[PDB]
Amino acid sequence: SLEAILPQLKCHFTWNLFREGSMSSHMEDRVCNQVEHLNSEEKATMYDLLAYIKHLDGESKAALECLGQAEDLRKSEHNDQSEIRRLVTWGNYAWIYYHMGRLSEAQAYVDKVRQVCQKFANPYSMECPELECEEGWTRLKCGRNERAKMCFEKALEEKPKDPECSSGMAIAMFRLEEKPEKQFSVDALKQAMELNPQNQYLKVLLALKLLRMGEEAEGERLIKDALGKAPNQTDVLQKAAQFYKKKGNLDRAIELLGKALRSTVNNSPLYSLVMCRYREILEQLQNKGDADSSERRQRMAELRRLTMEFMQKTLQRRRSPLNSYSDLIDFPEVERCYQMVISKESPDVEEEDLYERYCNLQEYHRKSEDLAALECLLQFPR
Amino acid sequence: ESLVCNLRQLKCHFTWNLIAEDESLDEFEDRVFNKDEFQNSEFKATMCNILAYVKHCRGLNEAALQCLGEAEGFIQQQHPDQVEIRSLVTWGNYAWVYYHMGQFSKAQAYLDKVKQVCKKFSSPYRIENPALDCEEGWARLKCTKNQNERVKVCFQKALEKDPKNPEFTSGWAIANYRLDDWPARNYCIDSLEQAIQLSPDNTYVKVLLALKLDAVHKNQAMALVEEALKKDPSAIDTLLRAARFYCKVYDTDRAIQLLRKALEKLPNNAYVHYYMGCCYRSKVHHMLNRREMVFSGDRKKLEELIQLAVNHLRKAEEIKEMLEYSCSFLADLYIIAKKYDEADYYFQKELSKDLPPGPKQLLHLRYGNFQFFQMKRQDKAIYHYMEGVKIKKKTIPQKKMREKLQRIALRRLHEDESDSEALHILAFLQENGGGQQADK
């Protein structure tokens, strides 16, 4: 009877977060990049999501620890809305215990969620597939096609095949492609920046918009302000380096990424970005007939040390289904830089290795059974 | 009073806030009913509910009650099994209308009925509250890859329920930025094919699949239109959509017969007259490019074209100058017809109307070309090009207008009348040059 109760809850286990079938580099480093730059409300949300990622990786015991920390922050603050936000966390205990086999324990939290939901109940409305179609038709006629698309799409998830919803979704798709929906960016970003006056991430988003619109004096002034106030934030540094790359300056873009790489201990995702940029600048200097320069050497040596450091970093890592999946993605890029940097400049030192062992690890990644099981559950095509 | 507090919690057409940023109710009703007169509705209850809401907004309530009764009748007619679930919105409409009138007992009774149905069919664990609608969405921002469309909806719900909140506003702004940077790509071919195969006898998605795609199908695409007309001869949907499709076919003898059949249905409509004007115009322009030869029928075709265009213009446009955008077609029609005085009359009629900056600069470009071709003088043309370049909208007609200014710079060498206005032209062009080397 407990199996039927679980699908009715709202938690990360009932939202289809990975519907696309495409996943990024493992989110361990992306989800919890920096924790000293956030407030209490954002800290609680991060820990709720971090438990879901860990559980898929197989570390059920560590998942409970991530949930407990978010439990403490929400309990510490006393507020009416804080009680409601607690419903997401209690949904994760029920799913994790039931999977882990502790069926008796999971019944306690299913009981507890019912009293909280009973006090704040709305006795004049409900949710069902039939109530999403009637709203979908009305939004279609009034001319809001984008909102009508999602009312039909969310109704098909409950009923996989339905001749009425399917007809409606095709009409909304046809109307949208005929005339695209308008988007407001500069108005919304300016309005949001006025409500939040101490946020610099929204500053570099607007400047990147203004650069493409045709104004650089406005854009460059905004970025110089943002970098001065918060010069040790990874999010701002990556966006700032992108702006200069779009503008046409590659020297300054390189320096900003090098600063960002030395910011946090979770610098694994940044390795792929920096490696590509050195390849682009070195290929450019061939066009300028600069086959040899103290400056051309001043770049080739740096690419030499980064390739060894990344390869050394990969080998010293615990083996997990998510680590193996992310390793295969970065293999094509790291290989291409290998022949470019070292095989051409000088014969490779045999005794230094860091190669033919890394390649051996790649072959073992494909044969792993645990990766195959994970992809089937997530329905990722091979 | 507690009555309004309870009424605020219902979900119906009144709460959904249908009309927004519409200068009048007349524009709303026209755009919903007359303009897309085709669609009608798959579910007949929506039209009656919308009409009842508009009628109440006008000031009449008995008509609203009658329309709502018709909506309930249609609901009972279509779905007998799910009559309880499907009737939930109309009860809210009764409650709101009765409360507006003053009979509170009926409003209370309908509220009790809604409460009973909700209590019988509700789930004990689920809840709806914008805090959860925000948590779902902060999860999506981190987890998503390229589909940012549901993030924006999740944030709009929370923002609508409680505005002026910094967190919801930040989420909405980020979603809008991400959607603007990389637009969502959607394709109707697979969805349309699936919709047809699941439920035949729809006789609408067939026509949409024909006109939108399957150009390679050719005669096979036309077969869909023939079968759609065969299955339902009384459907105005297929009738209007097939007639517009035949304009691409360039077979007016067939499209006009269909449009006459349609006019036999709704005589007062103006877009029926508009489509006939589009049908002669597309055929005569097609035959003007290379058919040549006797070139006689074209004068007649233009005559009926202009008469139908005027029969359009006399209605639904004198009231609102902006709508149908027909005056440009009228002007170019006279230009092809070689008659110029009514041509400038109608173009000046068009020019006085406000337009968005893009259409404005397009109008300036077109009339600059005209003022060049038909008039010996050049000062008016350079003035109108200056008028257009005064608009700072960035678009490809504006780039063509910069090319026009380069031409006028050549005409400075050719004609002496250009004088210092050419100096201002080259000043603007060197400003543009400074800008483009600034973009580097």
Main pleated sheet of chain B? none
**Oligomeric form:** heterodimer
- Briefly note the structural class of the backbone of chain B: mainly alpha
CATH topology call of the largest domain in chain A: Serine Threonine Protein Phosphatase 5, Tetratricopeptide repeat
Radius of gyration of chain A: 26 Å
Give the count of helical stretches of chain B. Answer: 23
Give the CATH level 1 class of the domain at 2-121 in chain B.
Mainly Alpha
The CATH architecture of the domain at 2-121 in chain B is Alpha Horseshoe
How many angstroms separate the termini of chain B?
65 Å
Please, what is the CATH homologous superfamily of the largest domain in chain A?
Tetratricopeptide repeat domain
* CATH superfamily heading of the domain at 2-121 in chain B: Tetratricopeptide repeat domain
Largest Cβ-defined interface? A-B, 82 and 86 residues
Range of helix content of chain A: over 70%
**H-E string of chain B:** HHHHHHHHHHHHHHHHHHHHHHH
The whole-angstrom Rg of chain B is 28 Å
- Supply the number of structural domains of chain A: 4
Main beta-sheet strand count, sense and barrel state of chain A: none
DSSP strand count of chain A: 0
PDB class: antiviral protein
Keywords: innate immune recognition, interferon-induced proteins, non-self nucleic acids, antiviral protein
Assembly: dimeric
Entry title: Structure of the IFIT2-IFIT3 heterodimer from Mus musculus
